Design a binder for this molecule. Structure first.
Ligand SMILES: COc1ccc2nc(C)c(O[C@@H]3C[C@H]4C(=O)N[C@]5(C(=O)NS(=O)(=O)C6(C)CC6)C[C@H]5/C=C\CCCCC[C@H](NC(=O)OCC5(C)CC5)C(=O)N4C3)nc2c1
Ligand SMILES: [Zn+2]
Length: 197
């Protein structure tokens, strides 16, 4: 069929700045430039940092570099390429059973180190640069110390859960809610990433 369309690439549209004493979101590309970059797959913007804000034509979420792989959720990215300076980059990891995908980390990004602390005092980083204390409750669950409406977590899948030392403990996947209040989060453990690799 000569009519059949191709889905666009995932596009980096900003980042969560964790460099200093204050966490804050930065936008690096507007909606229109995102639209064109998604269709061409050609993204000339400089990439920095560990947590990227990413978008498709219809969804926005996060992606996190750990050990030289930019990781995110399958329910956001599907099987899509990511835009890069030389054109679309095909996924190097895809696992729908884990809700997980990964591409080679962009040039200029910084990678988080996988946590080996065994600590259960975690920190979730959201797309609004909120740093949310989370107590680990199992291999893939943690409770929010201060619950809040799921609205505040929407769009943060693909972001990191970090240990007190700033290592990557997991990738935020799903919210566990009661009457619209997020009491707990479900995440992909970093060990599951390390095994996928
Ligand atoms: C298609 O192929 C696949 C393969 C595997 C897969 N595996 C999943 C677990 C999954 O789940 C769905 C997406 C996910 C998010 O919503 N993810 C974010 C998020 O932010 N997404 S997002 O906005 O960035 C978006 C949509 C990308 C743009 C983090 C939340 C934030 C708010 C959630 C509010 C309402 C939703 C509450 C819900 N809860 C829950 O399902 O609990 C289950 C469990 C743990 C047993 C009890 C929930 O979280 N999700 C539902 N889809 C798939 C799909
Ligand atoms: Zn650690």
């Amino acid at each position: 069929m000569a009519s059949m369309k191709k889905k666009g690439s995932v596009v980096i549209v900003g980042r969560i700045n964790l460099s200093g004493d204050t966490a804050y979101a930065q936008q690096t590309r507007g909606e229109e430039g995102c639209q064109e970059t998604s269709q061409t797959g050609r993204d000339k913007n400089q990439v920095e940092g560990e947590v990227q804000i990413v978008s498709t034509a219809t969804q926005t979420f996060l992606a996190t570099s750990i050990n030289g792989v930019l990781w995110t959720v399958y329910h956001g990215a599907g099987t899509r390429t990511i835009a890069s300076p030389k054109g679309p980059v095909t996924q190097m990891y895809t696992n729908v059973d884990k809700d997980l995908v990964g591409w080679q980390a962009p040039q200029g990004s910084r990678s988080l180190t996988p946590c080996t602390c065994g600590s259960s005092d975690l920190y979730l980083v959201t797309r609004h640069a909120d740093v949310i204390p989370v107590r680990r409750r199992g291999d893939s669950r943690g409770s929010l110390l201060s619950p809040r409406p799921i609205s505040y977590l929407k769009g943060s899948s693909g972001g990191p859960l970090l240990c007190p030392a700033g290592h990557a403990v997991g990738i935020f996947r799903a919210a566990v809610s009661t009457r619209g209040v997020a009491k707990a989060v479900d995440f992909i453990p970093v060990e599951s990433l390390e095994t996928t690799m």
